[PDB]
Swiss-Prot record, chain A:
This is Chymotrypsin B chain C. Transmembrane segments: none annotated. It comes from Rattus norvegicus. The lineage of its organism: Eukaryota, Metazoa, Chordata, Craniata, Vertebrata. The chain holds residues 169 to 263 of 263 of the full protein. Disulfide bonds join 18-32, 41-70. The active site is at residue 45.
């Protein structure tokens, strides 16, 4: 029950790698991340997951389901934002 | 080491989603001053608020803005069964005043990709719904 804002660094685990841990539930609308040795995730549900892009912190994903361990065996799962852009623009310009 | 405390204001776009009780129940990111991104499994209602520029939910009466939500846009392809397209856009009634401890995060392009092995950061108060 941390009262302070926490942070962690975890790489991106290839699709094949995340598949041998979760199964077929993993689709292309998902991104997984985790670091060997880790057994805890800091982000909240719907919490960001930002990567550097030519010098800018860009939202690579959103904390979806299975974000309890964060290990190379049990990498967390995130909504692949990149693949959800076509839907965000639509609403950002139609409302 | 699973993670460490963040320097306040180091992640300006990071908000806290709470309810009429003032209790945090999900995280979200400010992609604009009137638009906030979050997750669908979070189940947000117009009855929920958006706390910005916060760091310690303990005390530290740091200047936090309690934004109000006007609309909620939950992706239509999302179920509690297959949990796909877990994305939700929130429209605030009151917008956020960008500042030193409050700004928005840059979004990528449908053709932008973060290859396997690149290191990224994640922030939060550790509260998940599922
Ligand atoms: Ca505070």
């Amino acid at each position: 029950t941390p009262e302070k804002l926490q942070q962690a660094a975890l790489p991106i685990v290839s699709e094949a790698d995340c598949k041998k841990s979760w199964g077929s539930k993993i689709t292309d609308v998902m991104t997984c991340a985790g670091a060997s040795g880790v057994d805890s995730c800091m982000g909240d549900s719907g919490g960001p997951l930002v990567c550097q892009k030519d010098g800018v912190w860009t939202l690579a994903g959103i904390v979806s389901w299975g974000s309890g361990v964060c290990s190379t065996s049990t990498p967390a799962v995130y909504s692949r934002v990149t693949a959800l852009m076509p839907w965000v623009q639509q609403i950002l310009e139609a409302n | 080491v699973n993670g460490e405390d963040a320097i306040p204001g180091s992640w300006p776009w990071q908000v806290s989603l709470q309810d009429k009780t003032g209790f945090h129940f999900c995280g979200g990111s400010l992609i604009s001053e009137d638009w906030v991104v979050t997750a669908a499994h979070c189940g947000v209602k117009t009855s929920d608020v958006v706390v910005a520029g916060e760091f310690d939910q303990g005390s530290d009466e740091e200047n936090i803005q309690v934004l109000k939500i006007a609309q909620v846009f939950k992706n239509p392809k999302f179920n509690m069964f297959t949990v796909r397209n877990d994305i939700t856009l929130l429209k605030l009634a009151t917008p956020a005043q960008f500042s030193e401890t409050v700004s928005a995060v840059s979004l990528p392009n449908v053709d932008d990709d973060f290859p396997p092995g690149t290191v990224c950061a994640t922030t939060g108060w550790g509260k998940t719904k599922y």
